[PDB]
Amino acid sequence: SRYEKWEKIKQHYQHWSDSLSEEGRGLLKKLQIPIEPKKDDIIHSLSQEEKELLKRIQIDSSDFLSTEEKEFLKKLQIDIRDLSEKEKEFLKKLKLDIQPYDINQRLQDTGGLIDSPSINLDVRKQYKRDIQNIDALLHQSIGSTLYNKIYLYENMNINNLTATLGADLVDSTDNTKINRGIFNEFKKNFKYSISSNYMIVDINERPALDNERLKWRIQLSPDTRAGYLENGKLILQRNIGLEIKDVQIIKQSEKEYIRIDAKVVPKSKIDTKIQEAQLNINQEWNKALGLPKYTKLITFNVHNRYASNIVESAYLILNEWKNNIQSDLIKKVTNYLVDGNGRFVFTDITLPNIAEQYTHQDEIYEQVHSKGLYVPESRSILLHGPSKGVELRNDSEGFIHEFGHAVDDYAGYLLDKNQSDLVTNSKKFIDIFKEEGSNLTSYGRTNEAEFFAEAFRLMHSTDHAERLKVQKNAPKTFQFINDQIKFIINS
Ligand SMILES: CNC(=O)[C@H](Cc1c[nH]c2ccccc12)NC(=O)[C@@H](CC(=O)NO)CC(C)C
Ligand SMILES: [Zn+2]
Numbered sequence: 001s002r003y004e005k006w007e008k009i010k011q012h013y014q015h016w017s018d019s020l021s022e023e024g025r026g027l028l029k030k031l032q033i034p035i036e037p038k039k040d041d042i043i044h045s046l047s048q049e050e051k052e053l054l055k056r057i058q059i060d061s062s063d064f065l066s067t068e069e070k071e072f073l074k075k076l077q078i079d080i081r082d083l084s085e086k087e088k089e090f091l092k093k094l095k096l097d098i099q100p101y102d103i104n105q106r107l108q109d110t111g112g113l114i115d116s117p118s119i120n121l122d123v124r125k126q127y128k129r130d131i132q133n134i135d136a137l138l139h140q141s142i143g144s145t146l147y148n149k150i151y152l153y154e155n156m157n158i159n160n161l162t163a164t165l166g167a168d169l170v171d172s173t174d175n176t177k178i179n180r181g182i183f184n185e186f187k188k189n190f191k192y193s194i195s196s197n198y199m200i201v202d203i204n205e206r207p208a209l210d211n212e213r214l215k216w217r218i219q220l221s222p223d224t225r226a227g228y229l230e231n232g233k234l235i236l237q238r239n240i241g242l243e244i245k246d247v248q249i250i251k252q253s254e255k256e257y258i259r260i261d262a263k264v265v266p267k268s269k270i271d272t273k274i275q276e277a278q279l280n281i282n283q284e285w286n287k288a289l290g291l292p293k294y295t296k297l298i299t300f301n302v303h304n305r306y307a308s309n310i311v312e313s314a315y316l317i318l319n320e321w322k323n324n325i326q327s328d329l330i331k332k333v334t335n336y337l338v339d340g341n342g343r344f345v346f347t348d349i350t351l352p353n354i355a356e357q358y359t360h361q362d363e364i365y366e367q368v369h370s371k372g373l374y375v376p377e378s379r380s381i382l383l384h385g386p387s388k389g390v391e392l393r394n395d396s397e398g399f400i401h402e403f404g405h406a407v408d409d410y411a412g413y414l415l416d417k418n419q420s421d422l423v424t425n426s427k428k429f430i431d432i433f434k435e436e437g438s439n440l441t442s443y444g445r446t447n448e449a450e451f452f453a454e455a456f457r458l459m460h461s462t463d464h465a466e467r468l469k470v471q472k473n474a475p476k477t478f479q480f481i482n483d484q485i486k487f488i489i490n491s
Contacts, residue, residue: 002204005150006232009203013228016140024137027130028229031198034102037072039079042097050090051080057087063390063443064088064368065095072098093365096120103130107197107238111303111349118352118367131238134198138225138237147222152201152234156214158258161306162186163388164395169213178213178249178256186247186258189312192270193242193262196303203232208257215250215257218242221264241270244308274302277311285318289334297338301347301354310385313395314346317383320396321403324460328489329407336410342379348386356380372398374405374453376422381406391441397457404456408449411484414491423484424448436474456481 010017020028046054059065059073061083073094099119106127110116114128142150159166165186171177201218208215220226225237246261278300286295298318302310322330336342343356351357352367360377361367371389373382381402389398412423423429425448433448444454455477458470471478 006203009146009150009234010228010232012143012146013140013226017228020137024133027133027137028227028235030101030130031103031134031235032200032229034100034105036100037098039072039076042076042094043079045097046080053087053090054094055080057091058083062088062091063446064370065091069095069098096364099123101126103127103134104197104200107131108304109350110196110353111301112196112239113303113349113353116353116355117358117362118350118364120364135238138198138227138235140227141223141225142220142234144222147220147224150203150220152203152218152220153205154199154201154216154218155206155208155212156216156305157211158186158214159211160386161214162309162386164392167388176255178258180249183249183258189309190244190247190306191308192244192273193305194267194270194303194307195236195240195242195305196238198238199236199240200229201234201236203234207252213257214260215252216260216262219261219263224264239267241265241267242305243270270307274300274307274311281315281318288322289331291335291338295338297334297342297344299343299345299347301345301349304348304386306348306386310346310348313385314344317346317396317399318344320462321399324400324462325403326485326489329485332488332491333403333406333410336413337379337381337406340379343381345380345382347382347384351382351384354382356382372402374402374409376405376409379406379409391443397461400460401453401457404453405449407456407484407488408452411488414488422449424452429480432476432480436477439473440470440477451477452481 043051054073054077057077059070059077062070065073073091101123106114106119110118114124114131117124119127157166158169165182168179168182169186171179201216205215205217220236224240226234229235241264242262243265244260244262246259248259250257250259278298282296282298285291285298286293291297298314300311300314345354345356347354350369351373352361352364352369356378357373357375357380358367360375369384371384371387371392374380375382381399383395383399383402385395389395389401392398392401408422408424409420412425413420415421415423415426424433429452430448433451437448437451438445440451440458441454444451455470455474458466459478459481461467
C-alpha cells in the first residue's frame, strides 16, 4: 500500500536523513526551488536612458525570449512605468541578468557539460560546487530488497521531450483525449532515455498538473543511488540511463495520459548505443555523398530524456534533406562544409552549450538558443530536437532552413574565394530583401540571411503549393535563389 511503501523508503533513508548537515539540507532545498533574480537590483542598475528604453519596448514582439523571460521583463516594465536593432541589443544583454539559479536546469541545458561557457563565470563556478556537493550526498543505494518491490513515478510535460509533437498531442476536439496518431509518432523511436540532472520522483503516483500528460513509471536498479525528500519523494543520482519498456495510453478519472514504463540501466550502456549509431550514420552518409573514408560530419550530442528519438530522427531528417534538394547542390555544399571541418550536430542540449557555437562566440549576449543554427566560423549546422520551430511543421524543415544558410555561405565563397562573404550581403540581394522581405514568413523579415534561408526552405517544401507561393509573392527572391543554386551546381 501507499503509506507502507512510503514508510519503508523513509526508514531505509532515515540514518542518511539524520546525518545531513545544515549545508546539505540547504543544498537540497536549493535544488527543489530555484532562486529568482530580484527586480529591485536590476532596476537600480539601469540608467535613465535604459529605463526610458525599457519603458517603451514591446516585450511580446521579441522572438528570442522565452515566455518566462517575457513575463519577468513585463514585471520589470510594470515596476518602471509606475523591434529595432538598438532594442534587440539591449534585451540580449539584459537577458543575462534575469536567469534564475536552477541547478537541475543547468544540468539539463548542458547535458552535464557544466564547464560550457554559456553563463557568467561566477554562477558557473557555484553550480559546479553545488553539483559536486550533491553528488557526494547521494551515496546510498535503494538496495536489493526494495528495487523490485516499488515503482517510482514522475509526471512530465511532453514539451520537455518534443514541443513539435506537444503542439498536437491533446485531441483538438476533446481535452480529455490523446491524439492517437501523435501518440504513435511519439512512441515510434522511443527506446531509451538519459537523465543528466537529478530526477525528483514520487514514491506513490500523483495527479498530473494540467500541462503534464506523460506519467512515467520507473523501476530502479538495486545499485541506483538516491536520497529521501519530504512528502514521499526521492531525489535520484544524476547520470543514469533508462530503457523504455512500454508506452501506452491510460485513463485516470475520464482523462487520458501516456504511461511510460522505464527501467534504470547504466548510462554507459546507452552512451555506447548513441556512439555506435553516430559511427553508423556517418558511414552511411559518407558512402552516399562520396565523402572520404573517416569523415566525421554528423555528431550526436545527446544527454536528455528523449535521447533515442534524437538519434533516430537524424536519419529521417537527412533522408528528407536528400529527397528534397538537388543532389549536386547537396554534394558541393557539404564538401565545402567538410573542408572546414564542419559538422551536422543533432542535440538535445541548448545551442549555446554546443562547442561548434561557443568556440566562436565568447560573449554570452551573442550566443543563441533556437530550433537551429548555422555557424559560418565552424561551417556547422546545429539542430535542437526538443524545441519546435514556430512556423515549421516538422524538424526536417528546420534542417533545410539551416542548409539554406550554408548555401548562402558557399555561394558567397565562390564569388571571392580569398575573402569569403555571404551572398546575402551583396547589393543585389540587399535590395531584393528590402523590396520583398515581408512577403513570405514572419521570421523571414528578420534580416537578409533569414529571408534567404526561409525562401530557400519554402522553395524545397514537400508542399508544391509552398514553392509556388514563393515564386508568386517573392519572384525576385525566387529567381535569385535559383540563380545561386545553378551557379553552385555549375561550378
Ligand atoms: C524556437 N523558436 C524559433 O523558431 C526561433 C525563434 C527566434 C526568432 N528569432 C530569434 C533570435 C534568436 C533566438 C531565437 C529566435 N527561431 C529559430 O529557431 C530560427 C533560428 C535561425 O534562424 N537559425 O538559422 C530557425 C528556424 C527557422 C528553424
Ligand atoms: Zn536562420
